[model samples]
Target: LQPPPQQLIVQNKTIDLPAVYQLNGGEEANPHAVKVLKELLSGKMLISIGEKGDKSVRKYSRQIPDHKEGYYLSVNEKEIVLAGNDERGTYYALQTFAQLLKDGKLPEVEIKDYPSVRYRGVVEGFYGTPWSHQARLSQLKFYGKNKMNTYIYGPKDDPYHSAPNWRLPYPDKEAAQLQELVAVANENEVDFVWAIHPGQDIKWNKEDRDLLLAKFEKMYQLGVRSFAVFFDDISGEGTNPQKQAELLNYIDEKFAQVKPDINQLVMCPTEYNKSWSNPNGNYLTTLGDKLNPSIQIMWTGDRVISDITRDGISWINERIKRPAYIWWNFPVSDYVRDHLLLGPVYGNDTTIAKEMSGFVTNPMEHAESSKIAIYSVASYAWNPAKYDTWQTWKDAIRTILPSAAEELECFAMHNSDLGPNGHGYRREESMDIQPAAERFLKAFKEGKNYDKADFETLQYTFERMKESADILLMNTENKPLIVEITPWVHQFKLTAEMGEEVLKMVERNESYFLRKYNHVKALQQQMFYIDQTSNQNPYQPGVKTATRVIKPLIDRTFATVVKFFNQKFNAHLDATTDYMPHKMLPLQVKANRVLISPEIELDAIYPGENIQINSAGLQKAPVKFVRFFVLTIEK
Candidate 1:
């Protein structure tokens, strides 16, 4: 018959064993594996498992798996058996696999590994294939690529499950296509766990429910083992709390009636975390433990870690405790900004979700940076203990693009993790923003003017910024992200074209921030000013004013910035602007030529007659005006 694809090859018989076989395990330093893999493939493609006789061999182990009982070892004779009931075990297997492939010999190697995490899956999404049979395969291949064992489906994407063609009661042609996806995943040594939305899937009717049940059965027949029930956004306001228990009961009593030994059910009881402390509300503990003890938790929010910690492994382990799945909020690309990558560990811990029974990450479709975003999370899922997030991120990405590692380090500089100038009011007190900003500026210059001679570094820098753009746009807040160009303004301030470009970049950054903050008013106002879609607003032209070299033009810009800052500083602009006491602290705008400042004067502590109009009011006559001089620094 036809031979298996290059990605997979079956060993028949016939071939001699090579002298040395190397194995690289875990998610850390995958670049080393890339180099080693190239060398192994330079010679042999396929051979029998028996090609290598009983001889000693070496392998690496990253993490332990739940199914250790099935492992058999014959190290003396150069043989070892590996299995993972969780991500750790599987990751260990990956390293071993790499060694086998690298050694160029199919020694009598046998592995009996299953993952410790039942749901080890990655969210692989692409912008190209939407609304076709190819869509299923998109997620299919992504999960398989990273050795993720589960598959998750996201919202109103190009591949809309709510579409008419998808509402199936039976396993039509679509079922066959899904089966093919599952087959591909299995061939890659991965499993496919379909993500399902109860709200979308269940029409609250018997016909619809029956139809879905049939589809589930069909998937099971094709070897798709696990399932996730989405109850989020089911009924936003004051949803019926009992709805989940009822649904789970229905799924168990009805669906399981046909397929008694269903693989597993991951329950999403509206509140995976009781409080925002954990991404998963108390759904699992409150009901999951009692209703479906073996149920897995679905979490999405900042409180994910706190909740996990509070609930503790003992609590989670008590039930059908599984490694909790975290839905990271990282942006896939600058175009698709807002949902940012939230974590590589639990709460404030460094342990990856994969450390548990299994893990799954949810990513939006069409976002390119998602490859990196999801990959970062998956690397931890593969083996959290073995990989250092900061280092592993650089390494894994470099493999796919070949030049993203160092570049990302540069991007991290400008966007201070401690805080941006106008980021959330809650300051990251521990981290000083000034130094971080300075380092970023230095790197920016070197990165931007990088000589093509160092194309790798340049490529890394460009991709890093591109990825940063995606992340920034996705996470920008509403009240405008104000970046102080006072530093860089010195270098690029002369050219209007350069200034305009900078303004637009900031504008794009603003758009992304506003989307995430849901500050519609701020977004609309800025869009009008930056997109130049209107003619009446003062702030519209004021954008370019900051960039122009016109004498005192920047002065005008400072005046506007101070005014706007006061207006948005605390959400109390209208009432507080008039009451603000500091008159001498001018809004300072320093330029190569000069600096413009907002003059402040001490008026009456309270509204008094001297400042009051109409003369009849009782007011203080003791009023003074103080103005600070604007300073310039140009030659």
Candidate 2:
């Protein structure tokens, strides 16, 4: 069970299955709850409308907490109770009860649960190929199971969501699909927050305002009761502070309040982070002072890309005049699409349960793989103090692929880091095996024989990597997950195979060294091809796996092996790796004129040396190469 119940106690007792159910307030019994119960059991139990029972669901209704979406569930030999403070609460109770049923028997237990954050779920807030309709539908049910309550539909690529077409309605086909998505979202009690990004191109006049309201009305008719206005990543007059506040307050008055069941309206500001939102500036203060407190302001913490903390949350809350609805950018690889963010959801301060209004993740483009991190986010925001990073991570993998959980973990641990990206965001990768790998490499490079335990650790980790990839390849349980990352998985297998062959060549430096090295070089090409082929994403091209620790460690070992093998044979051999084929360590230079360095840092290196300072048009510093033109290219 994820987003574990806030309060639960169970004794060593069992409530056998097939206990008859008597739905007292059937008219108010959540349809999805009834549907789920009907699916689980025969539901031969009484189902009556406009009626009350002495010992039915309504009996415990008063026992449920007053909190919205709160539930109190009790089970014993004599009777079972699934009480709710609201319809969504009952739906959550049924979801929890279904988990109990899956265990074959329910225990004598009591559970009181409710989400800590006011709103919690994902924002399709990535910038790539939008998820297909089917995937979006599945995500709603996944959210339901985890008790996550909100889903903001804000794919940056959707033209209707951004600049050129912010005032236009979605195409008919897309509108129909959105209706279907909203229906599913409603069933799961997930708020389908349809966001409009008009900040890029908006005329702060009645015509444009009416166009925006008309678009919101269209989405409302499509079953979208929740709405947001995104003013992020834009410029020009639209970034005017007062204009944004006026529009938001106008929307709150004209739409959010006028609509009977509309959820609170949220907006992402242009300067959405502390680094960008100046304290001296009037941007945030203007919005805070003028915009209705009922409207939530979105914040991206201290930086455009950084972890959440209580202090930071408080900082923004004071400025916004309300709890800052955090737009947590994690596991969101929009800025680094080449790598998968499959690490533990940590860094967020657990103590900020009441300090913020909502916690929503900006996930990666890969829908299925993104769930691992989403699962942890749900766990964290639901019961922040109870969020155990590593433990939650393990459980998430187990839940995603129980049969091959360890194998998936083996692969996911190495794929956590974003390699090198502009955001400077990083995660722990290959941590358990990194020390052993470093020790082995250090000893190997220094010509000192390493401990057998270190050798076995290195060998075993690589061997497991290969085996895990094979198991994941054969996994049929999570076909979608496997399919989504199959290309990287294949790269993982090849990388593992190369690791094994490299180790073998080291132990038996006979004629087999050439055989192994030959295959390793070929595999490098194959791996590089996979890297180049997999990612057609516009942001970051190519696939990156284990780049932080595994790749570097292996590439260096490979270079060292080539060095020793060539010395033994009195022959020269290519010891290059595709890792950073044309990299320049640090191309440093100085001139009395304009100064630059790498003169540029090349991300790759392989050829001996081809760099020459062109001083024809520029002067060079004496005894120093200066004014060199360096563009990122293969050496």
Candidate 3:
């Protein structure tokens, strides 16, 4: 294996080297910016700094003109060996200096200078509305803080639907929101790529698309520098690789017609390889050339960035033969309703960003808790050299809330499993035991319920979660992954209302379970008669109105239950006879009657047949009907 790349460090608080170079001009344009760059790079032993076009230093120095890439220096023991080529190189080289500072006290760092691609970003979700404006800006802040140069702002299922631009409800309001976000991002020296869906998606069409384009023009006029076209479901099915290319070509045609040139263009067609619903097999490699030759194509997987370590940027670069853009799904959000755990369907964060340009984050529904993983992923995106995600999160958080790091860390860890309906299923938030089992054992053993200790262990075990918050905040052992603290520690209170909700589940399941058993028995009795040649009138309804009424109710219940179970399970459970258990007895009764006078004919209806052809020409089986009457008679 190739050993880990050489590492380096620098201390910003201790060093000052102003005598090495002099600026020829624009030194006063941003003195603070210059000072920051200087402080960030105080300890690099490799390079020299110079002002103006120094022809002598040209042999040893390479100048990078963009702020995105910083300055570098090469030095000998006595004098500066190589001078920075430009201001951008100087700023970028400062990032190398900060990386060392951030890595603790380490020694011997070899450096390389070259930027393969210019864009990297992730677009997941945000906190809320206007204040949520801070969410994107804060991310850009991280981008700038970590030397990331670009950020994509295509939000999922929110302010950014296809309707009136990605921003929801109030486009004007969101424009103002965008103004603030871009202003802050620009301050951090990061690029904001505004994302908008242009077609049938999130509830917008052609008219809405036009309106959104107009709005997009306005936002760009305001400050947004880049844009992404996200087409998830409306574009077409994922399985149809043909559909994926067709849609891309279609989108490209439209985008070209629009003649949009004010900003960069990126497209997310959701034609990823791993999505079960509508995956486009090899869609990226197949359509890379045809899709918009001018714009960057985004690669996404169904679950996450599928095959990142193996087929990430390198595969994409080879396939597209261009600068590949990656939108990594990270720190997934929770389901909208439950907001207690990570969303049921999501992939973990990606750590390696090698031989690729940049990254974008697409977080899940709950944006707050996703920070733990997002910050982690950002570490790798910023530089292949910085691999420890936990340290990245810790260092970033400490910078903002130095004293509250431990408390915040504990909270993040504790709520990590929180999402809609408890997707993680890590914490048994709604502890339940099988009701029938509990009741049956209660009657059979003459006991109150199933093991009380088991129930207590599930319900009462979380009572002390909050009390230990402080201790967890103070401890350093729990790093990288957090230890979950049950909310039961705070209180194991299942109120009457909460209990009712749970009991309703128990009741519903019992009804479903019992209904299925009863249905299978009823069907079996019908099957027996239907199979017999002796019961020839089994298809006809007899002149037994009273029995028919009761039987029809049973039939209705059985059919409905079967349909519901099939729908809910969605083929997870097969609709087979094996699904039926052996019994369908009522609670108080030993054996519920599945058939009454089934083999024998009833009085006056038909001597040999319980069913008789009615005037309406309808067929009716009377097993449930006769059984109801017989049970009444037995009572």
Sorted on TM-score, best first, the list reads: 2, 3, 1
Alpha-carbon lDDT of model 1: 0.39
Give lDDT for model 2. 0.81
lDDT of 3 by residue, 353-372 (tens): 44545566666433433444
- Name the weakest run of 10 consecutive residues (lDDT summed) in model 2: 586-595
Q: Report the alpha-carbon TM-score of model 2 versus the true structure.
A: 0.89
What Cα-based lDDT does every candidate model obtain? 0.39, 0.81, 0.42
Each candidate structure's TM-score, on Cα atoms with residue i matched to residue i, is 0.51, 0.89, 0.53
Clash number for each model: 53, 7, 50
Residues 160-231, model 2: lDDT tens digits: 998879789999999999999999999998999999988877998999999999999999999999999998
Give the candidate number with the greatest TM-score: 2
Q: How would you encode candidate 1's per-residue C-alpha lDDT over 1-635 as one tens digit per residue?
A: 00001122234442334444443222232233233334444553121111011111112232222252112111213333332333333333434455454234444444443333445555332222332455455545545555565665434332324333234433457557767877766545455556555464355557766665665666578667766565654455223345555656677666654465556576554554334333354545445445554555655433332323424543444433455555433332212121122122223243434435545554433333344545555555544544455454454445334433333233323221211112121111112233333343344444343233332332243344445444433332311111211111122122222222222222234445334223323332343234232221221111121111121221232233334434554332221111122344223221111122334443233322322112232344333443334322221
Instruction: Please rank every candidate by lDDT, starting with the best.
Output: 2, 3, 1
Better of 1 and 3 by TM-score: 3
The TM-score obtained by model 1 is 0.51
Clashes of 3: 50
RMSD of every candidate to native, in Å, equals 15.8, 6.0, 17.2
